[PDB]
RNA sequence: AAUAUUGACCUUCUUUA
RNA sequence: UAAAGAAGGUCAAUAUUG
């Protein structure tokens, strides 16, 4: 029954820096039996489930690093990491539970780093796949940064669209850095008809594409 | 020692209905508050209703009456949420969340996902990745062609959790794709077993492909 | 919880005409479940206690007449008199039971009548008081209209100011009409020390004043 | 039929404390909740708290949490208010009023005077009225009293109509009353016309003939 | 011990069928 | 009799403290 609203919808800073996010709420969400604000904190890391790290607005939760502070009152109301963790990287909500259970929209924080140049690794078809009459060429590209990232297919160096599968990551929870996949699928009987399969990565740390390729023999 | 196991995975043809559980341990199953949310994919937290176990008294979000039905076992000390007439929008996944009588969230669930569709499972097929023919060497696992979701991966049982990214689940016609690959030092291969570890819980498909030169 | 406030503290018609007054409420009274106004509507008489005339806003309680009227919704309500009675000479009070229950300032309510000339009458002491020691000579000036009014006692023709008590009615109930009475006290000694005790009062309704007198032993 | 009949008046030394009870009769005592009302002299209503007589349950308004204790009796139907310290402000009318639970109020008691002061009690003196065509008025004098209220009535309340009783006027610190009635001249001294006062902080009550 | 809160049961009141 | 809402009481528990 009460709205809350955070900004900035996302935020990047360096790590060890501090950061300051907001929650505001419609009305005002301090009781006046206790004298106490009835808003949360809580943090979702990529793929796991939230986790509660304040209540009462600034009291912190047994188990939770002395990094996170709550402050504010009535109806704004801030969330500050004193320095950020390449782990910290996560979504963070506000909470208020005075007039039922609403939710805020959440705040994304990203970490800013140094550049990282990507490491290229190529993969033949497995014997297994071949049998069944499949062939998929995989190309792994781990541990790069910033995100921007290009990948171009080639066979006996003409460039191919079609049959072509990527994922990406998020940021590393050590590293902060990137990571990204590209498969090929095409049918057993095409590809014993070509010899050479590249793979050809454009990023910005290198103004010349990174290279990978094997040659069936 | 507070902990909220919640049961698997769960499948749905649209119309129908299904029943999750979480059971709950480490505290006073009746001295407590048993909330649950749900966080549609890519999107937000939200609220649905929770139970007293004592008196297994409800409160329920307005949005979700009709749609969502509490209740308890104190015998098991578990929880049990249950959706009717399921439709595309109730795809999603479900947290339970434990409180006090009812204060805030303070404990809870891995969740449990929930996929409404017609299309009917489909098991993947595994394939282990090799270099062809430096300090280190890369290996590669590929899971591909499956429904619905999800699909778990470790290498080598979860003793191997340094230098490994497991990439998300692409859909690509009507089916999903995952990949995942691993770095070790040139000593460590292939003088050391390396075995990638599926498992496909809706088709009950668990496999164990090692990598071989 | 929620403020009430009536507009009109003092308001005047004339016998047979219509009347209305207004509550305000800082707040909304109007439940959202059941769509009812937590408001009623009280009437006291002089000298009697509260009496339920309206609630829910609007709905009249039974046995009270069909003149009595209310209306509105959310902060602004209005009771209404088609026609006034003499007995309806009262103050109205508006009440609120949603948020706590908080009353209202009250409006008295005055009637308006046609001129009456006032009934004078005069008492000696009695014999019981004049036993003990004291006579007091009480002079009644009842039914009379309008309600302003000087008295004077004169003691063989001479004004007397100290050791008078006067004490006014309210608007009577069936003749709309005010009523006074004046009493001068004095000992036994100085009452039987003179022969004439008269009480004059001064009304619109007479250009000469009204003369009212005893003797003594006459 | 619903009646709710209050205690007669009460006078108190400051600083004491007084209770005073309000007998229902007309309906189920037990399902109706019991309010208590304050009225200061010339000043508007106040609400005080209620009582549910059922399981004895009260809510009290902020203003009279350590002043007023509401209690009620189930076997008669009657409900109880205590007041506790009386000052100067809670000299006033007290009534009970019944509503539902809550609901509003719907009926009211005729209302229960309190006076606090440390004056003692002063009886009043009562003296008849005579005169010295068609119609003839007669009246009845209460003379130095106190404290507040008293009762009059002619005839027994056998007489009702073409009476006019005076409000009381404060004078040397003591309080009087008067009252008169207009009857015809055929009624008196024929039929008699007796004035009946009452006292109830004296404990006294007069019967004084109007005698020709 | 006090205040406040959620749920269940019970009595009763209120708006409706 | 049934639905919804409200007041009080009892019971279990939670929160704020002293």
């Known amino acids: 029954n009460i709205m809350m609203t955070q900004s900035p919808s996302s935020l990047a800073v360096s790590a060890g820096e501090k950061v300051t996010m907001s929650c505001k709420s419609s009305?005002?969400?301090?009781?006046?039996?206790?004298?106490?604000?009835?808003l949360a904190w809580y943090q979702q890391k990529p793929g796991q489930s939230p986790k509660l790290l304040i209540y009462?607005?600034?009291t912190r939760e047994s188990g939770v690093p002395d990094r996170f502070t709550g402050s504010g009152s009535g109806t704004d109301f801030t969330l500050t990491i004193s320095s950020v963790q390449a782990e910290d990287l996560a979504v963070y909500y506000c909470?208020?539970?005075?007039?039922?259970?609403?939710f805020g929209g959440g705040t994304k924080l990203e970490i800013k780093r140094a550049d990282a140049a990507p490491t290229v690794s190529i993969f033949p078809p497995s014997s297994e796949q071949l049998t069944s009459g499949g062939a998929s060429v995989v190309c792994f590209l781990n541990n790069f940064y910033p995100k921007d990232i290009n990948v171009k297919w080639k066979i006996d160096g003409s460039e191919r669209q079609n049959g072509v599968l990527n994922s990406w990551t998020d940021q590393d929870s050590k590293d902060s850095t990137y990571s990204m996949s590209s498969t090929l699928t095409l049918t057993k009987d095409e590809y014993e008809r070509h010899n050479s399969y590249t793979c050809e990565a454009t990023h910005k740390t290198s103004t010349s594409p990174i290279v990978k390729s094997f040659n069936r023999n | 020692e507070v902990q909220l196991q919640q049961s698997g995975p769960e499948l749905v043809k649209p119309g129908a209905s299904v029943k999750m559980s979480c059971k709950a341990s480490?505290?006073?199953?009746?001295?407590?508050?048993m909330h649950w949310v749900k966080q549609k994919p890519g999107q937000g937290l939200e609220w649905i209703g929770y139970?007293?176990?004592?008196?297994?008294?409800?409160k329920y979000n307005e949005k979700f009456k009709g749609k969502a039905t509490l209740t308890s076992d104190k015998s098991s000390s578990t929880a049990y949420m249950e959706l009717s007439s399921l439709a595309s929008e109730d795809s999603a996944v479900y947290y339970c969340?434990?409180?006090?009588?009812?204060?805030?969230?303070?404990?809870w669930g891995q969740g449990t996902l929930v996929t409404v569709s017609a299309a009917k499972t489909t098991a993947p097929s595994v394939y282990p990745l090799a270099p062809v023919c430096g300090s280190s060497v890369t290996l590669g696992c590929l899971v591909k062609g499956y429904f619905p979701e999800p699909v778990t991966l470790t290498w080598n049982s979860g003793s191997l959790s340094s230098g490994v990214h497991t990439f998300p689940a692409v859909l690509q016609s009507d089916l999903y794709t995952l990949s995942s690959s691993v770095t070790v030092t040139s000593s460590t291969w292939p003088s050391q077993s390396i075995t990638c570890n599926v498992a496909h819980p809706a088709s009950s498909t668990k496999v164990d492909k090692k990598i071989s030169a | 919880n929620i403020m009430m406030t009536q507009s009109p503290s003092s308001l005047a018609v004339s016998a047979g005409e219509k009347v209305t007054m207004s509550c305000?409420?800082?707040?909304?009274?109007?439940?959202?479940?059941?769509?009812?106004?937590?408001?009623?509507?009280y009437q006291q008489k002089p000298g009697q206690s509260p009496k339920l005339?309206?609630?829910?806003?609007?709905?009249?309680?039974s046995g009270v007449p069909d003149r009595f009227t209310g209306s509105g919704s959310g902060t602004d309500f209005t009771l209404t008199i088609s026609s006034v009675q003499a007995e309806d000479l009262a103050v109205?009070?508006?009440?609120?039971?949603?948020?706590?229950?908080?009353?209202?300032?009250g409006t008295k309510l005055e009637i308006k009548r046609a001129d009456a000339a006032p009934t004078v009458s005069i008492f000696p002491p009695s014999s019981e008081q004049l036993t003990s020691g004291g006579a007091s000579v009480v002079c009644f000036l009842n039914n009379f209209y309008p309600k302003d009014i000087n008295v004077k006692w004169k003691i063989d023709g001479s004004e007397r100011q100290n050791g008078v008590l006067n004490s006014w009615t309210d608007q009577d109930s069936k003749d709309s009409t005010y009523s006074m009475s004046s009493t001068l006290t004095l000992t036994k000694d100085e009452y039987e020390r003179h022969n004439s005790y008269t009480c004059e009062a001064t009304h619109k309704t007479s250009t000469s004043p009204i003369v009212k007198s005893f003797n003594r032993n006459e | 039929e619903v009646q709710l009949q209050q205690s007669g008046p009460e006078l108190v030394k400051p600083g004491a404390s007084v209770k005073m009870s309000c007998?229902?009769?007309?309906?189920?005592?037990?399902?109706?909740?019991?309010?208590?009302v304050k009225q200061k002299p010339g000043q508007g209503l106040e609400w005080?708290?209620?009582?549910?007589?059922?399981?004895?349950?009260?809510?009290?308004?902020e203003k009279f949490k350590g002043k007023a204790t509401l209690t009620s009796d189930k076997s008669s139907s009657t409900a109880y208010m205590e007041l506790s310290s009386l000052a100067s402000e809670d000299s006033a009318v007290?009534?009970?009023?019944?509503?539902?639970?809550?609901?509003?109020?719907?009926?009211?008691?005729?209302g229960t005077l309190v006076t606090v002061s440390a004056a003692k009690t002063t009886a009043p003196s009562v003296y008849p009225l005579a005169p010295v065509g068609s119609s003839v008025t007669l009246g009845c004098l209460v003379k130095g009293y106190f404290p507040e209220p008293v009762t009059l009535t002619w005839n027994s309340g056998s007489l009702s109509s073409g009476v006019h009783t005076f409000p009381a006027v404060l004078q040397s610190d003591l309080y009087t009353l008067s009252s008169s009635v207009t009857v015809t001249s055929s009624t008196w001294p024929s039929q008699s016309i007796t004035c009946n006062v009452a006292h109830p902080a004296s404990s006294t009550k007069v019967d004084k003939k109007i005698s020709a």
């Open positions: 969340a434990r409180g006090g009588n009812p204060a805030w969230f303070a404990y």
């Open positions: 480490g505290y006073t199953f009746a001295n407590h508050v």
């Open positions: 139970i007293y176990p004592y008196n297994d008294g409800t």
């Open positions: 009305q005002s969400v301090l009781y006046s039996s206790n004298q106490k604000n009835y």
């Open positions: 009462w607005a600034s």
């Open positions: 909470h208020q539970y005075l007039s039922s259970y609403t």
